[PDB]
PDB file of C-alpha atoms in Angstrom:
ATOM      1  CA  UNK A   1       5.942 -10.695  41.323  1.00  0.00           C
ATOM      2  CA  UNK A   2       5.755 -12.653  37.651  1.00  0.00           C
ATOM      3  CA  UNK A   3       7.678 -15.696  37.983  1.00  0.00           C
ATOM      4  CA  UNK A   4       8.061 -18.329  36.005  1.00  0.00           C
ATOM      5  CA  UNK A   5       6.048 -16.471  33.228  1.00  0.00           C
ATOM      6  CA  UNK A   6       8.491 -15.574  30.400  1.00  0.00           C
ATOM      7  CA  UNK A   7       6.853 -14.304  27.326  1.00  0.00           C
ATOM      8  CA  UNK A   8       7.521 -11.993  24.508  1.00  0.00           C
ATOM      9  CA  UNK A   9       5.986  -8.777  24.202  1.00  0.00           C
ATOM     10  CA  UNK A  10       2.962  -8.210  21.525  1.00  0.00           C
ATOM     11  CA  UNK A  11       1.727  -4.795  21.422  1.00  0.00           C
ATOM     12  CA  UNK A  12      -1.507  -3.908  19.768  1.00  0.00           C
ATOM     13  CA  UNK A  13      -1.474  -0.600  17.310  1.00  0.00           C
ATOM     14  CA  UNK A  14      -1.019  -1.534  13.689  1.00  0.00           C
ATOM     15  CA  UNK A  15      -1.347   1.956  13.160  1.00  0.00           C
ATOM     16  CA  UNK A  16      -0.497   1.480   9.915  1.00  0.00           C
ATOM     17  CA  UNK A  17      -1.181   4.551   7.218  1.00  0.00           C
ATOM     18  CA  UNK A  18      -3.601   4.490   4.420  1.00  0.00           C
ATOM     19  CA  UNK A  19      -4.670   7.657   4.199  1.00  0.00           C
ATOM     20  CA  UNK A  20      -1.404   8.901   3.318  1.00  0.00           C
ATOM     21  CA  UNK A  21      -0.874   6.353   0.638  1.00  0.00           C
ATOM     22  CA  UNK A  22      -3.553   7.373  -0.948  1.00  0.00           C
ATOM     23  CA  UNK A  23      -1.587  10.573  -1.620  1.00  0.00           C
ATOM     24  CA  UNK A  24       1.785   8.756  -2.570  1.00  0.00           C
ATOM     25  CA  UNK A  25      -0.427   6.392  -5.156  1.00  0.00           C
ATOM     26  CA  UNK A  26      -2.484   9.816  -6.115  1.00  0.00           C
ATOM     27  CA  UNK A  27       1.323  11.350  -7.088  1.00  0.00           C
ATOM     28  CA  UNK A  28       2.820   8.181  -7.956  1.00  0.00           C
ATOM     29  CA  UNK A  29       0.162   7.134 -10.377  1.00  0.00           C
ATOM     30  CA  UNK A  30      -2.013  10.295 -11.801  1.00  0.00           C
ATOM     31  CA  UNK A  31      -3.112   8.472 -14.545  1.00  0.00           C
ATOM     32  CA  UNK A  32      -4.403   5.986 -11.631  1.00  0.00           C
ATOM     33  CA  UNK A  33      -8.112   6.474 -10.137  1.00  0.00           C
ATOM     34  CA  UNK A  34      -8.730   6.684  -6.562  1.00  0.00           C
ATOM     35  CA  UNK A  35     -10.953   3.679  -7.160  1.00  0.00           C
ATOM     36  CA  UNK A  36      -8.300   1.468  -8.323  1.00  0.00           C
ATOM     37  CA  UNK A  37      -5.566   3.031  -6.163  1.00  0.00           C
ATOM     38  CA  UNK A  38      -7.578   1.843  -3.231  1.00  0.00           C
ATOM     39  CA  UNK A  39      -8.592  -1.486  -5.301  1.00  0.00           C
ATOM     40  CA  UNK A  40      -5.338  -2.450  -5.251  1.00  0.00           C
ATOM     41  CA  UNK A  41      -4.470  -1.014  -1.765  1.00  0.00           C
ATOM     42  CA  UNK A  42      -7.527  -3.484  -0.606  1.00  0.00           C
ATOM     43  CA  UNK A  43      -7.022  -6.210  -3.158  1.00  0.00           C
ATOM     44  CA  UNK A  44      -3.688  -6.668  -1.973  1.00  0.00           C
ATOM     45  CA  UNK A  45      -5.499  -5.648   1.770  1.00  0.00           C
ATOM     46  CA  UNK A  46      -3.374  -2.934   3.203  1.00  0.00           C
ATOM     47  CA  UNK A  47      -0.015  -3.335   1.437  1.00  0.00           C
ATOM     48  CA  UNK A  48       1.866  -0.333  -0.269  1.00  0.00           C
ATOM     49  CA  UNK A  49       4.745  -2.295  -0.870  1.00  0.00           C
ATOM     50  CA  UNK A  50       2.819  -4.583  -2.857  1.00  0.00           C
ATOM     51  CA  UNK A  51      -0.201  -1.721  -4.148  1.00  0.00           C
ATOM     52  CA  UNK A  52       2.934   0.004  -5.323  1.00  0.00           C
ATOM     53  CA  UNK A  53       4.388  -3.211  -8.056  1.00  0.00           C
ATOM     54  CA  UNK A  54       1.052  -3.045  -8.464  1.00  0.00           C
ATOM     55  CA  UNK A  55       0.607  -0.046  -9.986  1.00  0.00           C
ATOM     56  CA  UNK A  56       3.864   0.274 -11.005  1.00  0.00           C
ATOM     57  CA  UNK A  57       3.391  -2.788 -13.587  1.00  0.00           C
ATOM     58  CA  UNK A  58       0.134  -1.568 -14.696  1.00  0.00           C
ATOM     59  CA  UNK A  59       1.674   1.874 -15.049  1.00  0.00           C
ATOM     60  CA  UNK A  60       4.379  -0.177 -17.364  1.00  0.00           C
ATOM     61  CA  UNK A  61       2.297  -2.155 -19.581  1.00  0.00           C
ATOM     62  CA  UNK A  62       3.293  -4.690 -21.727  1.00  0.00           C
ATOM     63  CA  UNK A  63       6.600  -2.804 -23.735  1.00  0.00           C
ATOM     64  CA  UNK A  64      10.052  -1.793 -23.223  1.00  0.00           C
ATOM     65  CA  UNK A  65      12.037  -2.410 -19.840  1.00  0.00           C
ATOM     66  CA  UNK A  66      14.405   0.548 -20.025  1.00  0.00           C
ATOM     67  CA  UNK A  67      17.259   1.036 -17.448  1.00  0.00           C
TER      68      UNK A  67
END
């Protein structure tokens, strides 16, 4: 029937993909160790997007900006 009853839908997979950020970080950053790779990836809790300006920064270091 469902009347009345008018919600949105809210599926449940966050699939999300760790495994193969690992391997983007792992080429991204060499100089990077799987322990901080994932430190970050966890720090920031599951969050390439962010584990990536992370890196990316650190990767930087304090010097020229370049571009």
């Amino acid at each position: 029937g469902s009347s009345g009853s008018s919600g949105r839908p809210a599926r449940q997979v966050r699939r999300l993909e760790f495994n193969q950020a690992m391997d983007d970080f792992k080429t991204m950053f060499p100089n990077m160790d799987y322990d901080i790779i994932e430190c970050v990836l966890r720090a920031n809790s599951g969050a390439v997007d962010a584990t990536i300006d992370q890196l990316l920064q650190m990767n930087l270091e304090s010097g020229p900006s370049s571009g």
